[PDB]
Each structure stands twice: as C-alpha cells, then as structure tokens.
Symmetry: C2
Subunit: 586 residues, 2 copies
C-alpha cells in the first residue's frame, strides 16, 4: 500500500474513451474468426486417443493434468495451433502455456499422451525450444508434465537429429539450470531414450509410482534379424518372442531410479499426487512478493475489454484510436507518454499492469498533418508507418527502459517504414537497425502484440519476435495479418517490368494480371490469423477480451525473480518524461 | 621454437600404424559416394542464371567473388547441400564457408546472384543463423558478400516472418557487434528491405559504385493506396508509370548513402575493388599471432591421409582402429591420452593442430574384454557403445579442458549408450546428461565429426551438434550414417505388437511385414551422407583426405582471438594426465 514516488507513479494521466456506438458487424466478424480458432484448437487438442480411453485406464490427459496443476484461471495457452511442418492432426503433440503453479508463473509443457503416448513429431522440438527460451527470457521456472514415448520412427530424420532436434532441449535444460532457472518435472508412463533424457535433464524429478525413465529399452536385440529383409518366417519369431514374454517391467522403473539410483526425488501413487509434488517443489523456488515492485495498487482498466470488439476494426482500411486499446489493457487506463508530439506516428509511454511499471510502444493510426519534417511543408504522414522522429524516440525509449530495468510491451499495427530518398537521407535504414541494436543490448524482457498489421521491416524493429533473446513470446488477435508487404504492392513490384515490356511488344497483359491476382490472393490466405498461429508467426491468437490476461501474465512473470534491479528513485525515464514536458528552449 | 613446458607438450606419444595393403573395394566405394556429393554440389551451385550471362555484364558470381576474396586454398565449404525445405534447385541461395581473409579465418556468406538475384528462399534464414552462430562460437569475423534483391514472394510466409526468419540475422548481427565480433559487408546490386538491413546491420559497409541499399523499394506507384484487385486499367497505369519513369536509379544509391548519409564507408568502381575493401578492414581486425598459443612447431600427421580410404570401413559391420584416424588428423600423429585403460570404449587425450593444443574425444571400436565392470565377469563390451567409465572419463575430461580453455574435437562412430537395468543402476542416464551439462557449462569452442555412425542419445552427448552454444559446426564423411537407431531394430520395435496381435486374430501379417521393410528402407535412405547434408544433420560431408583441413581451420579459428586464457604453466589437464599414469595407490 506504500509505494515510491506517488507524484510520478500514481494518478498518471488517463487515456481512451467510452464506447458509445457498439459496432455489431465488426464484433460478430471478429468473433467468427475467434470462434474458428477455438474450433481448430478444440480439434487439435482432442485428436488421437479419446479422453474416455485414456481415463478408463485411470490415467489423466495433458489438459486434465494441467487443470489440476495450475491455479484456476491462470492458464495462458501458447502455441496451441503451432504446426510448422503441417502434421495431419494439426498438433505438435504437447500442450503448452503460461500458468501459475503454487504462487509462481511458470512455462508449462505437458506431453500429449492422446497422441502416440507423447511421441516426438515434426515441429515439436521447435515448440520445446521456444518454451525453454521463454523461461530463459523471463527467468521463470520451466515445468514438464512428462509422458514421452520419444521419437516417432515414422518421421525419424525430422525429429531425432540436427542442431535443433529432439536432443537440443536437453542442452537447453542444462543451460537453464546453469542460469539459475529451475526445471521441474513430474513423469508418467514409460519414458525411454528421448523421454528418458527429458526425465533426467530437469532439476527436480517427481515420478508417478508406475512411471519409468531410461537410456533405452533394449528391445529384443535379436541381432540376427534375418539377412536384413523381413519375411513371414522372421515375422513368425517376433510374434513368438512376444508370446514368450508378455508383460515385462521396462528398465528404469521406480524400483530402480528411486530405490537404487535415487534419481527420482519423490514418488506418488496417484496422478494428482505427482502434480502436488510439482507444486511442492515449485513452491520452494524463489520469487519477489509482487508488492516489492509495485508503484501503485493493482487497478483494472477504466473501460470494458469487450469494447475492443467494436473499437478494433477488422477492416484494415479503417483507422482507430490506439489509446482505446491502451486504455483497456493497462491499469486504470493510465499512461504517461514519453515525448508526446515528437514522432507522432508512435506512442511511447509508461504504464502499469497490476501495479507493476512497464514501458509501452504502439503505432498511432490516422493522418499526421504537416509531417514528416524531412519532407516539404504540407506533406501528410500516415499512421502505421515509421519515420525518423518515431524511430529516434523509440531508440531513446528502449534505451531508457533498459537502464531502468523496465519490461516493454510492444503493440504492432504497421504498414512499414517510410521509403524513398527523402527517407533514406533521413537515415531510416540506419535508425531502423539502430532500434534493433537498442533492443538487442537492452537485457530486459519484452512482449509483442501484433494487434493488426505486421509488415515489412517495421514488424522486425517494433520489438518483433525476431529478437529471440528479449521477446518472451508474441500473440495476435482476430484482426491480425502478417506478410512481407501488401500483396498488390508485391505483385506490381514483381511484374511491373513485364507489364511495360509486354505492352510495348503488343503482348497480352491478362496472363500477367492473373498471376498478380493469384499472388495477391495467396498473400491474403497466408497472412490470416489462422496461418499466423500455425506457422508460429505469433505464438497465439488471443480473444480481444483475453489480451489483458496475457499482458498480466507477462509482466508478473517479468517481475517474479529479476536478475537486475533499478531502484525507483534512481530511474531516469520518469524524470526524462517530466523534463521534456516542462523544458522550453529559450 | 620457444614454447612452454616442452616435456609435457613436445614429443608426445605417437599412435596409428602404416597402411600395409590398400583396400581397393572400400576406397572405390567411398570415392564413389564423395563423387556423387561433389556432383550434387556442382549442380546446386551452377543452377540458375548461367555464369556467362552474369559475367556478360562485368558482374561476378558468388563463387568468383569468394575466389578473389579468400586466400587460395583456405576455402572450407559449409552447408553447400543445405536445403531443409527441399527447394527444387537444391539450394538456399547462398555460398558459405570458412576462409582466410587477409590473414584471418572468417565465416564467409555470399549471396548467390545466379538465383533470383540472391532472393530469400525457404531454408536460407536457418543457414544464415548457423553462420552467425559459428562466428559467435569461434569469435571470428562474419563476412557478407551481399547481392540480395529481396524475397521470393510466392513463399514469403516461409522466409519473411517468424522468430527464425529473414529478420532474425539483423538481431544476430547486432549481438555479434555487442559481443565484440565484427561483421563486414561488401554490397553489390540492388539491396532493398531485407537486403537493405543486411547492408546496414554489419560493422563496416563497403559498396560497389552501382550498388544500393534501402529500408525498402520506392514502389513504382509511389504513395498510392494499395489495391485489393488488379484490372486492365490498373495494369496500364503500372505500365504507364514504368514508362513515365523510365531509367530511374533505385533509392539508396551511392550518391545517397556515400555522399549524403555516409553509411557506406568506402565505394569501389570494380567488383574486385569491393573485395579489396573487405580485405582492408578485415585486416584491421584483432588476432593473436598463432605462435602465441602454440606449444610446438606445426607438424603434419606422420601418416598419409589417403590411407583413410582403406582404414575407414564403409561397411558399418567392420571394426577398425580409431588411432589410425587420430594419427592422420593431428600433428605428427601425436596423442597423449587421459586415463587410458579407464573407460576403454573411449579415447580422450591431448593432441596438436598446427602446434595448437586441443582435446580429442573419439569412440574405440572392437571388443572390450572383461567389460563393463558392472556386469558379470567375462562379459564383453562393444566398441562404439558408451558405458559408465567412458561417460565418467569424458565428464572429467571435458571439465578439465574447459578449465584449461582448450578446444575439443569430437570424433563420433557410436551405436549408443548401454541399456538395461544394470546400466541404469550404473547411472548411465544420469551420466549421459551430466556430460551434456559438462559440455554446456564449458565455455570452450568445439568441433564434431560424425566419422561413421551417429545414433541414439550418444550422438547428443558426444559433443553433438545439439549443443548450439559450444559446437561451432559439424561435418561427416562418405562413411557417415545418422539415425535414431538401425532401421531393422526400429521396425521390429514398432510392429512387434501388431504382429502378435494380428496373428492371434487370424489376420494377414504381410501388410505389416511390408510396412516394416518400408521403414527399414526409409531409415537407410534418410540416413545417407547426402541426406545428412541436405537436412543439415552435418554441416558438410567432407572427403576423407580433406578432413584435417577442417580440423585445422576450426582450431586456428578457435585460437584466433579467444575471450579467455589459461597460461600453459597453469593448466591442470597435462598434470592430471601424468599423475594418473604414475600414481599407484598403495
């Protein structure tokens, strides 16, 4: 209840406005898209062995385990639709998300036992690497709810080998430990080879009484597996062998890894027990009481989140007030802008999330009168584009946030960076990379929300996911669309030369027109939210009224156990903001 | 010469044996495989616009530029066959390798201007991230010979966005700079957007007089609002603009980024001039005279490299003497083993590469009598497998090399870690991960050679490519085979249950038998050297007599400008080696 510098952090300026005219059409269009995403998630998650078949055997599913593991309502799904290599079931066979486990925000990864008992499938490794990366970026525990059969022989060369294959997570788990970031695992079922390493690499190993973990299974080792080719005779030996064996406890069961090696620290008889074990050890981990880093009491935004269904236009040709979005994602709709008026194409300011201080960077939409300065008077700027002042302001803002150890939330809706030789002379290329440099050297956790458009290099520089060390993860919405550039712009850039040549040659232009339209169509299809999630362009498409939940999870996680601290009374950004407001060059 | 501790580092024991009789069959089969690789390389590199046409107008190709950039004979090709997403031309449109530029080993990346003028294609980003990672791991300069026209629009969603897309290298170039690792670029042709950032992100920028770099293309239709569709009227408008505009210089040309902004430090009229500019600045970069870290004068191996064509059996059933390989890759065939006799399945010892000290770890093949110690007496161990002592020896060895700041060269030919509860109780699962932990916390550059077999978790723990921070890169040979396990074993393990169950239900077993044979066949096909290269399982398949060349480049690169130093007289590994051989615990 007592915080540092109330005059600077409490009762900051408020922004945004009340929703007067509800836009029924926009809302239903956004919800239709959200609904389709939910339907896609639903089927990806339920694909494979049925819950009933899993439960009949007294075993829980990944979603059921997570439900009993995390604090009610703290689950923040991540990569649900991630399927970079297009597996038919639309899944990567793991359920991941951010969730609070016994008081701590954790990155949670649960093997999906409905799918080949948690076998490794194409794209899974990449999903796991993003998981450890998120944990490393935010310095929060990585929790595994393991039930992994390992490599899927069927697509072996796609999941077993390579620099970023199934073995990479084991080095990442060692790195996390070495960085002082605990990895906690609760294991179920059989976990040989890859599963075995997923079992042994964590910091603390909790096991279900019927689980096992091992280097390998030994199999049948009948070396003399015929000449090489499998025949009926040989087949009639494997079957026999199977008969001459029936049940057989796999290597590395509790009698081995608990009683003998002591690798398993604790064993539980029930599925719920295992989860209780995870909670117990996650509870022993370090964290700062959130109050320590608060500058104000937690406060809900001053406007309903649902208003966004009307205020965020799905039609990318319609502009809107970015402040309405900010007003609905941050505490009490408060925002104290840094250098307002300078670099009007962007909003850079200080805001709060459950009392925690963070920096905010978002595109401003609409016309920008008599702008930019490096163009002739009378020129008009376009909201969504980046110019010189906006790039300079952001460079300074990120650098100040970095010094003050403040996390940054980036909200993207951009059509790119200004082009042409006026822009080039105004150093936009140098300034764009300077921002990338500023971000890369910041050492502060960051979150990126591609509200609508994510295009060209602006998508990179605006705290894009391309900054793997600083961006914990990114989300999108029903209004999201990501592409290199506008399809038509690309189409004309790719064929303009041919159009002129063919016309001067008296050649038909229709075929070139068809290709241009097909390309434009392809750009549209491959830029939809659905595809963004599937390829991982965003780690999750989030419902308009679920966005603040992610901002909250990110920020609380960012402040859960920071590696570095800047005392509030020693922060410069708050003072620089005040200073720019009052100082007049006279 | 004058070196530290001659008694420890000079005249170390020698290993290997002379080649009595050459194995003609083995040699021809190995060479046949190498020839196919070379032919695949020739095809991928030549693909696209013919050299004659590129040269018709004074322009040089990537390979021609590299030949004039690097010191003759120092080129070490990397990822020549890398094509993870299977582009039809078998290329990712870049020519990469390690090469000496004005006295310094550098990771060199050149835009392949024969392919869509160096456009970004699926898989390129990953190839570029490996490039910056190698430079980061070895702490050597990254050199770009840029000629990047842009993006292959019809696959833009595969190359433009995402966490590891075309924009990621811009953050990686910022990181390299921040880590004190220079990035130098010589630019040719038009470089808008992505190519623009590849031009501006480096430390030093050199440009050809006709080259340009920009945040993005000016776009023929100026600041005209994009169109959702293309009709004939619009087509003519485009044709009208190209004609109206006629011959127009792209934005960001020399008159802009040299004369005005000064982003281009130097401009050269000829293609060769640009390369001279690169050499000029790379020459200004820091490096240690190799003599500083040498402990002996460079000496070639005591045996001919070509013997490897007879001594390295293509037949994975034939054993061989790993000392013959070691004897032909390291200086004067010298090797001073660490704890020889303990953990006989592995060789861990000190060796020299052009006088530079390095650690060597390699699998021993053949039968290991009265081993392992945790099994009944008289049992026999299998060379190529990993047991308790081998794993403990390697953990200690790696940890000692790390303390002494010595690079490590791993030579793999393994069938995995021993399995079964005896092995489990001997802690092989814990020891395997311990080794991964030892490697991850080492902070020393490492090189991995998959001589033949790279399988199971052993592939991971034996300095596997999966250790992204420490492994600079990996190579293979014509004898290489990489897979989760042997096909037959996988097939039986995957269909053992369906065989016994289908037979009982009185069902045809032929369908399942066919699947097994298809699986076995797939395993073989997908584990061949060329596939290892195409997927990146190895960064390059190297000829038997070209292996030492990479060992040399790696070691010299590693000692070129080290971040940490351990004086020779302060190294413990040399002492630990001696003590183990003389101490008799009375």
């Amino acid at each position: 209840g007592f915080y540092s510098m109330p005059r600077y952090f409490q009762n900051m300026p408020q922004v945004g406005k009340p929703l007067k005219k509800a836009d029924a059409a926009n809302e239903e269009q956004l919800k239709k898209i959200e609904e389709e995403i939910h339907q896609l998630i639903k089927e990806a998650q339920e694909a494979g062995k049925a819950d009933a078949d899993v439960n009949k055997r007294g075993e829980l599913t990944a979603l059921q385990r997570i439900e009993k593991l995390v604090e009610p309502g703290s689950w923040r799904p991540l990569n649900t639709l991630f399927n970079p290599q297009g597996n038919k079931n639309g899944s990567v066979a793991i359920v991941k998300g951010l969730g609070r486990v016994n008081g701590k925000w954790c990155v949670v990864v649960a093997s999906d036992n409905k799918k080949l008992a948690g076998a490794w499938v194409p794209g899974q490794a990449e999903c796991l690497l993003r998981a450890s990366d998120t944990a490393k970026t935010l310095h929060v525990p990585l929790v595994y709810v393991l039930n992994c059969s390992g490599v899927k022989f069927d697509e072996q060369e796609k999941v077993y080998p390579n620099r970023r294959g199934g073995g990479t997570p084991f080095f990442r788990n060692a790195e996390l430990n070495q960085l002082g970031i605990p990895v906690i695992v609760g294991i179920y079922g059989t976990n040989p080879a890859g599963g075995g390493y997923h079992s042994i690499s964590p910091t603390v190993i909790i096991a279900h009484e019927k689980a096992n973990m091992a280097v390998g299974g030994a199999g049948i080792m009948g070396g003399m597996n015929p000449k090489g080719h499998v025949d009926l005779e040989y087949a009639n030996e494997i079957a026999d062998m199977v008969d001459r064996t029936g049940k057989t406890e796999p290597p590395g069961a509790v009698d081995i890894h608990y009683t003998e090696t002591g690798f398993m620290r604790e064993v539980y008889a029930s599925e719920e027990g295992v989860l209780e074990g995870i909670k117990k050890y996650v509870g022993m981990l370090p964290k700062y009481d959130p109050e320590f880093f608060r500058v104000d009491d937690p406060k809900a935004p001053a406007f309903p989140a649902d208003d966004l269904y009307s205020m965020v236009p799905l039609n990318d040709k319609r502009a809107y007030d970015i402040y309405n979005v900010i007003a609905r994602l941050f505490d009490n709709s408060e925002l104290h802008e840094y250098k307002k008026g300078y670099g009007p194409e962007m909003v850079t300011g200080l805001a709060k999330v459950n009392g925690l201080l963070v920096g905010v960077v978002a595109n401003v939409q609409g016309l920008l009168m008599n702008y930019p300065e490096y163009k002739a008077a009378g020129s008009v700027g376009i909201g969504g584009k980046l110019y010189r002042q906006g790039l300079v302001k952001m460079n300074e803002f990120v650098t100040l946030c970095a010094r003050d150890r403040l996390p940054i939330v980036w909200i993207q809706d951009t059509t790119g960076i200004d082009v042409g030789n006026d822009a080039e002379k105004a150093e936009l290329l140098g300034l764009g990379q300077s921002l990338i440099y500023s971000i890369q050297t910041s050492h502060i956790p960051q979150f990126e929300i591609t509200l609508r458009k994510g295009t060209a290099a602006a998508h990179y520089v605006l705290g894009g996911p391309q900054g793997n060390d600083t961006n914990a993860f990114s989300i999108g919405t029903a209004a999201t669309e990501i592409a290199v550039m506008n399809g038509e712009t690309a189409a004309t850039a790719m064929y303009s030369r041919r159009l002129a040549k063919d016309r001067k040659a008296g050649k038909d232009l229709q075929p070139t027109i068809d290709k241009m339209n097909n390309l434009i169509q392809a750009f549209y299809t491959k830029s939809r939210p659905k595809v963004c999630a599937e390829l991982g362009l965003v780690d999750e498409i989030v419902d308009m009224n679920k966005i603040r939940g992610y901002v909250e999870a990110f920020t609380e996680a960012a402040y859960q156990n920071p590696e570095s601290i800047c005392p509030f009374h020693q922060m410069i950004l708050p003072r620089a903001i005040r200073e720019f407001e009052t100082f007049v060059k006279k």
